Every structure is written in structure tokens, then in C-alpha cells.
Amino acid sequence: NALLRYLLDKD
């Protein structure tokens, strides 16, 4: 899940 990882890694 690239979108979920992005929501947890973005600033």
C-alpha cells in the first residue's frame, strides 16, 4: 500500500 505508507512518511 503505497498510499498508506506515504501518509505515514510525508511531512
Added chain:
Amino acid sequence: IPHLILELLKCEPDEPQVQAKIMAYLQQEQANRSKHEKLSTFGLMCKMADQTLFSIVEWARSSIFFRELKVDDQMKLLQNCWSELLILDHIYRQVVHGKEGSIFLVTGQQVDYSIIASQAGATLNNLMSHAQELVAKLRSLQFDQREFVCLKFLVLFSLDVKNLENFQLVEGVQEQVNAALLDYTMCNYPQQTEKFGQLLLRLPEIRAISMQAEEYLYYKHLNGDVNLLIEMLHA
């Protein structure tokens, strides 16, 4: 109040602002659409929960204990409890702001039940009425916010997730939050020896209602009826 419950209440989001942003997003992407392009009521609800999932992720992202797990452990916990948090948030919203014969959406809009019921269908109405029955008991038990955030962390830090590199903390928070809730319902609610047990027993029911909601939404997606909400529904 136990100091652990106090720490959980701090990570709670700004609900008036969360509801304001979701309402503004939908008022934008709906009045923006063409006359022959408007969203259905079922489509509007899918975008509401999709936006709600964003604030759910951001809530856990900065919540205590959760912000210490590596991203891989964070994704596994959220992918297991995302639909349960949606149902738990919906149920608690009807406990606080709810009126009889009305459904209160995440945007702060009040909808009458019989209107939504005409379009929800056979399965959703049974899933909605089952959730509304849980709202009725939680109301009769005086379900407050301190017990709401502990149930959130009990659902988030579920024992039903694995491939966790730090299951010690997930197991540690589960036992620790459970002990704080048992102490809270005992100290702040004598009279109700049945409250603590009744509170935990809604979790398998919320888990069942949410997992049955996933299997129906996945059924709707394969039929072409439904994007963060969709990517969480896979795997």
C-alpha cells in the same frame, strides 16, 4: 482519571476542524461536478469515509505509542483496524450528537434515517440497524469520551495483527489500556458492575459489523460501484 487515559485524550483530533475540512472538500467536488455527473448518496458516503480515513491515519500517526513503531508496523495495525475505527467513530457520533430517527454524518450534517434507509439496501440497513442498536446500549450505559478513546486504542493496538516487529508494545498497550478502562469504569461508574464487560463485548460486534461492511464494499467495488478507501480494502 488515570494518567494513561489523559495521555490518550491529547492525541484526539480537532473535531470541529476535521468536520469543516471534510465538508469543504465535498462541497467543492460536488457543486463542481456537472449536472449529469452528480454523485449518488452511496457515492457521497464513500467519499466521506475516504476523507475520514485520512484524518484517522493522521490521528494515529501522531498518537502516543503508535508514533514509536516503525512504518511497517504502523501499516499492519492500520490495515487491520481501519474499518473498525470508521464504525467506532460513526457509533460514537450517534451517541453524542445523535437524535432518534436521524443519522449524523462526519460533516456535521443531520440526515433522517428513513431517507438513507431507502437507498442503503438490504445488507446495509441490517448493518446500520445493528450499529444503531449498539448506539442504543452505549447510550443506556452513559458511554463517555474517556472510554471512547480507550476503545479506540484497544481497536488500534489489536492483538489480531501479526508480522509485527514490536508485538511487545502492541501487547503491552492492550493490557495497559484494558487495566486503565477497568479502573475508570469502576471509580467513575460504581452502580454499573455490568459496564466494563458490556463495553468490551461491543468490540467483537463492532469488529463483526466492520468486517461485514468491508466484504460488502468489496462486493460493491467488484461490481463497479465505487481511493484510499479502496486501497485499504485490498489485501
